[PDB]
Amino acid sequence: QNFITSKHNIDKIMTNIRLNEHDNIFEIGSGKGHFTLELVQRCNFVTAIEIDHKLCKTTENKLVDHDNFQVLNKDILQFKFPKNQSYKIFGNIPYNISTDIIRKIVFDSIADEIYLIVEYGFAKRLLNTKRSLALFLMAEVDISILSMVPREYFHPKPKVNSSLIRLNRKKSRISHKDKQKYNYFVMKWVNKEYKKIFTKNQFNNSLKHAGIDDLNNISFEQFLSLFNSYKLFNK
RNA sequence: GCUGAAAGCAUCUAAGCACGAAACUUGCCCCGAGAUGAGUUCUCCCUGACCCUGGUCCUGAAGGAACGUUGAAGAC
């Protein structure tokens, strides 16, 4: 359900989709072929993965005019990628896949540019720094909200407005060496037990060293500085 | 970081020294010997008889406790 059919809506959505000709594009949903039909002409190669056999066949006979694609169904939960291929990966809209496809795109792949259509709640929640999954997400990639998708766009019109989000990778840090410490850092931070990670000298002087005014509103860069101070204090 | 071989160079170290993190312990203030590992110092008081060899008598110290007038001490 919830498919976008109007070609005007498809064009207006693709207005924010920045895919180039020399990119292979992988997937997470073909739908009724409204978007993959334009996708096969925009980019070089398309990997159409669909969990519905009908939908696979309707994409096939909708795309018989093109040979620059291939279709392959490996439950997204188990599918895998060309660790040695540069690929903008475009995908679709899932149920919730709780850091399930998120891990597939930030932890189980080297995807350089990712586009999602999500529910406005997940657009605003997962952005906030009060959730740990956000912290492991911001560990090496960045998010930008390109646009908000109206709810009537889809065909069993949903109840909640959607939004378009963009993922790009900016890593180089706890790589593999202080990762187990970064994980040790995050869960103790989000669960708010300070004594396990700081005494009181450190807990107070780190905030002023990081320029912290209120603990109820935190940005990312000063959290990074706080983690650097933690590493300095704990060798 | 200085010197220096091990190991004809070299090097903060193997011999030594000098530093050094809004980090640690002290340096500031308070509780604290039920710390059963129960600590230390100063001062004061008790120097009878009998039978028996467990029974009586005489003696009541230093201090504490209780009552009253009460507190800028306090729910009791």
Alpha carbons A226 and A175: distance in angstroms, whole number: 17
Q: How far is the CA of A52 from the C1' of B73 (A)?
A: 85
* Closest to A203 (Cα-Cα) out of A230, A221, A169, A177: A230
Q: A160 with A117, same domain?
A: yes
Q: Which nucleotide minimizes the distance between its C1' and the CA of A226? A: B22
Same domain membership, residue A109 and residue A176: no
Q: How was this structure determined?
A: cryo-EM
Say whether both A153 and A212 belong to one domain. Answer: no
Are both A1 and A99 inside the same structural domain?
A: yes
What domain range is A51 assigned to? 1-125+140-171
Phi then psi for residue A200, to 5 deg, are -120, -40
Verify that A226 and A159 share a domain, yes or no. Answer: no
- Euclidean distance between CA atoms A104 and A81, whole angstroms: 10
Q: Is A84 labelled as part of a ligand binding site?
A: no
- A211: domain CATH number? 1.10.8.100
Alpha carbons A73 and A54: distance in angstroms, whole number: 12
Residues A35 and A95 in one domain: yes
In angstroms, the Cα distances linking A118 to A122, A144, A179 are 7, 13, 29
HEC letters along A172-208: CCCCCCCHHHHHHHHHHHHCCCCCCCCCCHHHHHHHH
CA–CA gap between residue A33 and residue A63 (Å, rounded):
8
Residue type (1 letter), A79: F
> Is A33 a catalytic site residue?
no
The type of residue at A133 is L
Q: How far apart are CA A191 and CA A229, in angstroms?
A: 19
Q: What percentage of chain A's residues is helix, strand, coil (to nearest 5)?
A: 35, 15, 50
For residues A24 and A39, the answer to whether their CB atoms sit within 8 Å is: no
Q: What is the bridge-based pairing of β-strands A45-48 and A24-25?
A: parallel
**B chain positions with any atom within 7 Å of a protein CB:** 21-24
